[PDB]
Amino acid sequence: SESTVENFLGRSACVYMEEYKTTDNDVNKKFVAWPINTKQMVQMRRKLEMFTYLRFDMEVTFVITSRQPVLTHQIMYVPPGGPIPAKVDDYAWQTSTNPSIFWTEGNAPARMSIPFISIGNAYSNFYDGWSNFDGSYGYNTLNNLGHIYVRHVSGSSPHPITSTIRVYFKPKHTRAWVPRPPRLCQYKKAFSVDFTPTPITDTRKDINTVTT
Amino acid sequence: SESTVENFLGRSACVYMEEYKTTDNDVNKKFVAWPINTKQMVQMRRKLEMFTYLRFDMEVTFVITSRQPVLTHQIMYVPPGGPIPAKVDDYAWQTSTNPSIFWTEGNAPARMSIPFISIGNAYSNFYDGWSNFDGSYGYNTLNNLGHIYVRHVSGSSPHPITSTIRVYFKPKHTRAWVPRPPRLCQYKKAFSVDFTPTPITDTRKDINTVTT
Amino acid sequence: RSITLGNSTITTQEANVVVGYGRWPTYLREDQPTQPDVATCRFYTLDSIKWEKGSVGWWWKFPEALSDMGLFGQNMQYHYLGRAGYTIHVQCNASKFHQGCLLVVCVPEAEMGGAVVGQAFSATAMANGDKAYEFTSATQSDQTKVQTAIHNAGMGVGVGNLTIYPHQWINLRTNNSATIVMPYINSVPMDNMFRHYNFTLMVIPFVKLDYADTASTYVPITVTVAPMCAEYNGLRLAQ
Amino acid sequence: PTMNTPGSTQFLTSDDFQSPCALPQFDVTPSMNIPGEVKNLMEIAEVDSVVPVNNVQDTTDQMEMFRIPVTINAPLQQQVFGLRLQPGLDSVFKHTLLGEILNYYAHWSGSMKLTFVFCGSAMATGKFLIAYSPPGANPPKTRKDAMLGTHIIWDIGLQSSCVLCVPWISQTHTSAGYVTCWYQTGMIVPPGTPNSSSIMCFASACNDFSVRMLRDTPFISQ
Amino acid sequence: PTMNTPGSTQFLTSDDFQSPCALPQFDVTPSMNIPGEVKNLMEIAEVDSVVPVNNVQDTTDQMEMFRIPVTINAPLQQQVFGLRLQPGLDSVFKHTLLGEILNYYAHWSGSMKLTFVFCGSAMATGKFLIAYSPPGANPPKTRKDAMLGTHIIWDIGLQSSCVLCVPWISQTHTSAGYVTCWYQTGMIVPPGTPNSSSIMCFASACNDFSVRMLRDTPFISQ
């Protein structure tokens, strides 16, 4: 079937898109930064919120383009609780515990599969509780996932390049536990269950109306 | 033999050719659009109209060239009953249920094989009937096939590129049912059996003439 | 001889039967219940057609030619999906002082292009009641008509190559009867009876009728059709 | 000599290939057994859910859409409700559990059951004639000719629930069945009993459902 | 070390290689058995089809090309028709079922049968002498010397059909056989019988046909 949970969520789809320019006044526009979460894609958010607990591996493939030699790009995954860079170049990119891919253009897209990382036994899409105890509702640190920072590798002298990074994401080997009823209201936040009440269904006219 | 139905229709041939320019006044000339049908190639149309029902898989390979970095091109197949894009960029290209190939130039041509998609048990080349019941003759939706939209992948700033796309098409694993007599008149439409009467055969001179 | 077939309607006749593609009509062998009606099997004799010196051909679309017949034509009003094969007996009555040839042929899914290219036509331009339509010797040139040129068969194909479909020849100096048993041929198991015409029947005279002087000026052709193994969707609740 | 073929050297968004592990030499915490594991999405659509039958225009309160009114004094042979059996397009069944799993697929067919539960007093009695029309047939116009089709006389004095199982449910991308309900012998109550009661309705798939071709839901707007 | 060879890394329009499925995880609807399945294109060319023998110049009506005239009063020893056996080039056999399957191939040979059916009255009698000339031999010029070759006296009083099987049929890319027919003892009818009759002709391959090298038909213009 195509109705298995595995194939239902097995699809791959775009989840983040951003640009950076090598030479820019801002130093936060010289590299990509991206907390990994599945609450930014409205379409796929609803499919992962029909379950209360999920357990999966991730597969992330990047499609990079550039506009004005061979251009190389580092792609660094930072596992949760690792150092995070705050500059285009600093010691956080020289860390040996943060996986990296040095990919050049004109080759098949970069890809890596991040395993199930969590000290719990499943991720939780819904958490009803507090972190410290009564900026704390509905957030726990067990469902936290890493970050991805790109940054164009270049010499000691930078040169103007504008690049666009697209990230594709695919759940893999999914298991799912405890159904939920599908979402009815539109999402108003990216990290809250906040909503505005909506009608149950679209009105008819009379109870005996059955016209096509 | 070479006389098997499988090898008779097993040949691959060009079926569509079109150009688009990245930067143009028209927004319908920034991407390719192409309903898949086998009624546009006169030569191959006659070979597929010697049968009333066919069942086959498709194999589509694209040959792309460009004229003024590495250039990337998305090639999106839209299965029948999927969203269709109306702009160079819109949410229909971000759909995760429409297969896509991100191919760069200077590599062996892109290719994919679309299976037998239809809820009937065969495609029908001829349908004598109506759709609603007495813009309806000779059209049914069971023999409908998807669409292909190209579009050159680029950054947030487009740059002038003119490309030419050629599509090659090959039936594969063909089965065929119920012969028809070969076509005698020329085709006057791309979706009708409309014709203008023609002589049965070329005249001789006398019934006793047998000269070479 | 005379086989004297009966079903509640008796027809005496008799060449040999030409079975479609070597397949006899057969029942389809849940969430689709189905159920056959076995009381529809019986001959229905369409009106006689005069074959004269003028006439150049005829055609009938099925199963829209049995739409006004009792019971079989009433199941089309109720059930919205159906199937059925057929047994067709075309037979002439003529002397030994007449001559002619006919081609009885059943063409499945015969689309017909209109007269005047790129023009739509009504559904009463090829099917209506049990009435027999007629081919014309000269090219049609009327807005609301099918192209009825006889030498293209109304499909833009050779008229001589229509012997690629189930057929039999009624040569008047040999035999005078033909029988074709057509099975159900479609790309789906069942289909709506009013939105689709499974096949067409055609009688095409190669060699015109001729009969000398002071003899009957026409030969009647009589088509008789009995549906075989008809089956329809169920109309009752499941358990 | 298959590394230079036309297929290879592309990215296809639906490919299955093994890919290098970002960090091997990491122990993954074992899975524990957690109650209730889903392995198919036809385990969610075979679960009953209240149908909002009375979704009539000019409902100024939600929660009044799940109740189908029945009263003591109502003219005999008057229709109580109508339904059109098409759980993908019809507004009534649109947002049920069944209806929101079938909007992720483009082709489906099966059979799906309904149940009608009388929720009035325990002292009320009466009858109802629940009729059924096959697809491609007009809904009945009178109680009299709705009794010449398929029907069940539901007596609420002896039963409290009546179940139908409707065959021939399909995507239809109309012709659809109908289920109608009519007054047969009003509603009769003894002294000191409420003059109004209601009927609730439940719907779910059977087990003959099959779904094909995944696609996006048309209930989400970016 | 075969991924850097000269053959690899090209597109050849006649290659057979497996290619990635566009969408796997899709159930394809099973095939049903439909009457009449074609598996070879020599099952279409072994089917009889009317030959337009009388395709003479100044035919103002189509349907007059399938009839070969025969009359009561015609001088004895007068030719009735001639044919040149070359089903690919000769106009007569050009657009038959046999002829339009052999224009897709560039080399072919076999043997192909003919049948001649008298379609006159049931009261007519007479004879005809059907002669045959081997390839590379002139057609006979008189009835007398057409009877010194291979021939069959067809009597239409006792038979209604006569079949020939012609060997040595080849592409010839001329030398070709001939089949001619002559009057032997006119046509005789009793009172009150039509004075004209016709002969139809059928043609098909036998089973010895072989075809090689597919190519485009020269009956289609873009």
mmCIF file of C-alpha atoms in Angstrom, chain C residues 173, chain E residues 68-81 116-121 124-132 143 146-147 150-162 164 179-189 195-200:
data_model
loop_
_atom_site.group_PDB
_atom_site.id
_atom_site.type_symbol
_atom_site.label_atom_id
_atom_site.label_comp_id
_atom_site.label_asym_id
_atom_site.label_seq_id
_atom_site.Cartn_x
_atom_site.Cartn_y
_atom_site.Cartn_z
ATOM 1 C CA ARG C 173 -25.681 -16.949 -54.985
ATOM 2 C CA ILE E 68 -14.212 -6.735 -62.379
ATOM 3 C CA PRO E 69 -16.940 -6.609 -65.096
ATOM 4 C CA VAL E 70 -18.109 -9.747 -66.930
ATOM 5 C CA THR E 71 -20.891 -9.621 -69.544
ATOM 6 C CA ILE E 72 -22.864 -12.105 -71.672
ATOM 7 C CA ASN E 73 -21.651 -10.782 -75.005
ATOM 8 C CA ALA E 74 -17.942 -10.278 -75.028
ATOM 9 C CA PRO E 75 -15.739 -11.695 -77.840
ATOM 10 C CA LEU E 76 -14.204 -15.063 -76.935
ATOM 11 C CA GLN E 77 -10.503 -15.180 -76.093
ATOM 12 C CA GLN E 78 -10.455 -11.637 -74.728
ATOM 13 C CA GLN E 79 -8.524 -10.824 -71.553
ATOM 14 C CA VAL E 80 -10.548 -10.035 -68.426
ATOM 15 C CA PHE E 81 -7.801 -8.613 -66.207
ATOM 16 C CA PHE E 116 -11.250 -15.031 -56.886
ATOM 17 C CA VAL E 117 -14.941 -15.127 -56.014
ATOM 18 C CA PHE E 118 -17.692 -14.944 -58.649
ATOM 19 C CA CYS E 119 -20.521 -12.779 -57.295
ATOM 20 C CA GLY E 120 -23.015 -13.029 -60.193
ATOM 21 C CA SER E 121 -26.396 -14.786 -60.268
ATOM 22 C CA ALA E 124 -25.071 -18.168 -64.549
ATOM 23 C CA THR E 125 -22.540 -20.640 -65.926
ATOM 24 C CA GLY E 126 -19.310 -20.263 -67.896
ATOM 25 C CA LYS E 127 -15.578 -20.825 -67.630
ATOM 26 C CA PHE E 128 -12.425 -18.767 -67.275
ATOM 27 C CA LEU E 129 -8.792 -19.682 -67.813
ATOM 28 C CA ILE E 130 -6.594 -18.242 -65.071
ATOM 29 C CA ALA E 131 -2.966 -18.294 -66.216
ATOM 30 C CA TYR E 132 0.281 -17.688 -64.347
ATOM 31 C CA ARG E 143 -5.695 -17.223 -74.744
ATOM 32 C CA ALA E 146 -1.645 -18.606 -72.003
ATOM 33 C CA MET E 147 -2.795 -22.206 -71.839
ATOM 34 C CA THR E 150 0.447 -22.974 -65.729
ATOM 35 C CA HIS E 151 -3.302 -22.555 -65.637
ATOM 36 C CA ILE E 152 -6.553 -23.554 -63.992
ATOM 37 C CA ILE E 153 -9.880 -23.873 -65.807
ATOM 38 C CA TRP E 154 -12.273 -22.306 -63.301
ATOM 39 C CA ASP E 155 -15.871 -23.362 -63.858
ATOM 40 C CA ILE E 156 -18.333 -21.038 -62.129
ATOM 41 C CA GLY E 157 -21.129 -23.579 -62.481
ATOM 42 C CA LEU E 158 -19.546 -26.008 -60.038
ATOM 43 C CA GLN E 159 -17.325 -23.689 -57.999
ATOM 44 C CA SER E 160 -17.750 -20.199 -56.688
ATOM 45 C CA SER E 161 -14.168 -19.620 -55.545
ATOM 46 C CA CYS E 162 -10.737 -20.636 -56.828
ATOM 47 C CA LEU E 164 -3.946 -19.683 -56.110
ATOM 48 C CA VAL E 179 -1.676 -13.511 -63.233
ATOM 49 C CA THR E 180 -4.009 -13.001 -66.155
ATOM 50 C CA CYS E 181 -7.516 -14.235 -66.798
ATOM 51 C CA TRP E 182 -9.161 -14.899 -70.130
ATOM 52 C CA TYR E 183 -12.574 -15.659 -71.563
ATOM 53 C CA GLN E 184 -13.235 -19.275 -72.229
ATOM 54 C CA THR E 185 -16.788 -19.868 -73.476
ATOM 55 C CA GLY E 186 -18.317 -16.485 -72.457
ATOM 56 C CA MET E 187 -21.047 -16.388 -69.849
ATOM 57 C CA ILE E 188 -24.408 -18.054 -70.428
ATOM 58 C CA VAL E 189 -27.609 -17.221 -68.533
ATOM 59 C CA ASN E 195 -26.688 -9.493 -68.207
ATOM 60 C CA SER E 196 -23.741 -8.437 -66.073
ATOM 61 C CA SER E 197 -21.873 -9.943 -63.161
ATOM 62 C CA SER E 198 -18.663 -9.153 -61.332
ATOM 63 C CA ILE E 199 -15.675 -10.900 -59.787
ATOM 64 C CA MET E 200 -14.115 -9.785 -56.503
#
